Amino acid sequence: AKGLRQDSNGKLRYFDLTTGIQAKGQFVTIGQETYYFSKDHGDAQLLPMVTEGHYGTITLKQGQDTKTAWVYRDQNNTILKGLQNINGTLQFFDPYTGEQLKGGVAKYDDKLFYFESGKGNLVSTVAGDYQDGHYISQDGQTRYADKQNQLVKGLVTVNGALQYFDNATGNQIKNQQVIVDGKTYYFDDKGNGEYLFTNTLDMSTNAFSTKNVAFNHDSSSFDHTVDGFLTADTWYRPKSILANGTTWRDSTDKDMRPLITVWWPNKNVQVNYLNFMKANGLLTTAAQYTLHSDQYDLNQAAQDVQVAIERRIASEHGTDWLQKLLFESQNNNPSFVKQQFIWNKDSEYHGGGDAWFQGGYLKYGNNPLTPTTNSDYRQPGNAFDFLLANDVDNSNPVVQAENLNWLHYLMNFGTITAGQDDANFDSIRIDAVDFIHNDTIQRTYDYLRDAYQVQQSEAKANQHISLVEAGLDAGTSTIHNDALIESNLREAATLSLTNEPGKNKPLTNMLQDVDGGTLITDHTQNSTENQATPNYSIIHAHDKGVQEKVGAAITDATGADWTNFTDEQLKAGLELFYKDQRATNKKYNSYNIPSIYALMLTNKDTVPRMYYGDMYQDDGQYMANKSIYYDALVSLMTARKSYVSGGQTMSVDNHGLLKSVRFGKDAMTANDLGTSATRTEGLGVIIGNDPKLQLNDSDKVTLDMGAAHKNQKYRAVILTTRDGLATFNSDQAPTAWTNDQGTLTFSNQEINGQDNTQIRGVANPQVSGYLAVWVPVGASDNQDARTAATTTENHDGKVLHSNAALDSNLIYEGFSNFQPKATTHDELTNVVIAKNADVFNNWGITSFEMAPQYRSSGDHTFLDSTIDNGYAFTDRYDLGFNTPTKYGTDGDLRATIQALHHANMQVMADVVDNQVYNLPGKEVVSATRAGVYGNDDATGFGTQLYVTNSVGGGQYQEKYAGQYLEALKAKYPDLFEGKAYDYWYKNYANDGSNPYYTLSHGDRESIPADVAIKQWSAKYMNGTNVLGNGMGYVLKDWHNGQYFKLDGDKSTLPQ
């Protein structure tokens, strides 16, 4: 007795065709209908299918809260209750409320069944259902005891959640896949369950399936196969073909058929493959195929699909139609492959607190089957690891030799490409310094010590001033002060200034420059030098406090998310953006920008960097549209070049107004007389964040300008007015005197009837509080307040020091993310810069930080590759050859670089060692889900072999990569040897107190010269962003987890 038949007595039962077992207490799908058979003696029960039905939501308050419940309801508003059969799946609804049950259990024929978290289809029999009982901890394990003191074993629901416990011991399984009655479930690090896919039974190779076996294990018989692994998109060559669904004939070498028509990874896929064919008229049948259908029926069904297929192949004398059917998209829907859970992003489990960008990451690992993509290293060696794209493994010796080789290329770009020596870069900027290994950072600085001797003297250090994207947390950097780091000014400004009226904290935070507890510099009484940490102050940058905020206007009146959009949508955004920026009340923009630039450009012990986007607007081309802040900013820069020097003394009086002041070259405190040049130097700033401020007639605000400035005339540089700020670049401006002491006394009245000299609250586009800058009258036409860096020898092993000489420098971040693409050669950014070389030198810019000049991948994966700023690149050696980059060609870059050298500036090469975008070539590697911190994530993806987009490069990487290494090892052999070093390490205190730094120790290995990364591959990467291929993309026998591989002694699936 096997199949559906009725016995001697009344009614009908069911028997497994395969085994012979009677179905009782189970679900089976026999031909058309789906049934349930009873616990009693298996007498059956019909579950009619529901075609046509609304599917919606209602409100129900049971007792506590009004919940909004989901319901099915048929066409006719009758809300369907109890167990129902819907599209050949079984979902369950509460018969009282009508609510859909998904991720839970239900009593049905004194038997508890479970429904998946997702769609809420019936997948398996659950063992026990517990609200009574409690947890226990025994032997360092976790377990669960019933109400009656005894243990629970196996798969049960504990307090509404699904969980599982070892059948022998009762140990709760955690962070592991496990099979229960052929169903694979995943249980998280906490222990809570989730269904994945029902596994097939896998039966004996019969008459028919004999001839669908693979012709041989050679490579020729298979295709679409990365590194010898079978993917879902693999076509194979059978031993024989069923010509026209009739004549079995030996297969020829030109014959191929798709693996997914004969083999499947789980029963889910197989059931969906059949019902898919039913839809597209390759299997005309009144039969219905569910997760409860007999394997025999499903496999027989799979053979009838081939019969019908082979007809259509015979007809069309080819198989391009099928390729199109299974693998390409149909009727604006995902393809058949992608529809499947095991072959899409849904089984990758994207997102999570730790997954900052592109929905998380995939940390590569090692595996016997994949000896090409295996790596001994892949250690992060820094606070963070993964950020974007394909994270490059910088712990690797060959990658460290390649990072030097690229450095040397950039540092000698002119000399290499065009034989032009004045066309080279001088300084660098390490992009994402906390995201790359310290070894290559250490080794990077060593190159700059070896090639330019920056440690020797501050004259040589200052000519090649480099900097990073980090605070004190970049330990390798701060240890010997090899580069500048970002001050806390930006943050400090963000609380006490950049917010709207009423949401601004007091300006006492701006007195000191502290990076979470540790002090960077204290402006209160800054009289000494060579003390503070070499740093750079900013308020905006290409990415910091802009992309966030610009995006804001883009999405409103446009809706496109900030990572991908059309040029039109961008242009429409920026319109509203700049249209808000010029207003008094600013939704998307920041307040008091000039006041903030005033601080940056007057504060001691910092090298401020100007942001292009604050002076010019991106609605127009490069240096095309001036911003509202332009005049204000140009004046302050001009003030700095001529006046700002000497010591600093900043305070906040009782009225709430910052009073920064500088005393001039030589003079370090308010009592110091100083040299004759001091008299016409040093300015005084007054700032305020109360636009509703109104001092009364008795109130007096003062600026003690110092003992050098007794009885001297002082003229305004910047003055707050009703409409904005009255700028002044010359002694032609309102003036005011100091008393016998040396003190500019102001008040709510005008100074000698000079309008706009009085102190008061004001609300206007360029300032929401008060801003006034004052310098001494009688400056020379060619005065300079800047101190020239000594050729003086340094023995203390520091590179950069904070002194007059360094504070004389002024960096310029000369690009934006949201520039439009030029329409002509003249409108391109690197030509414009070359034209306007003197315009920067006049403002007193010393360092000019260009945009990474690398060809963008233009894959619209992330913002950086949407708007093509140059951080998103494949060939990192291509700086605009042949076809231009956003900024220019390689000819235009060399023209720019020389234009800056001729205008006495240094040029910064922005170095991105972290990641690389869009590498077309494919490889198989073991990947596991991870977060920025290079940490394993507890996901149902687990650890799988994944086809990653890791092989690639470009024409110019082939050419240049690795080539200058043997050169370099000759000249500077110390770069290539091993080396011990020290670096700081930020510790976060658990008790909610301030962090603290501790000296850590490091040892970089030696590196090779001979080995060259001509192109990238898996083995030189730490990992890759989630690609969305799927958990089961590299195919494997999910019963036992054996991967398929093509060797002489292959592990073939068609078997």
Ligand SMILES: [Ca+2]
């Ligand atoms: Ca990294």
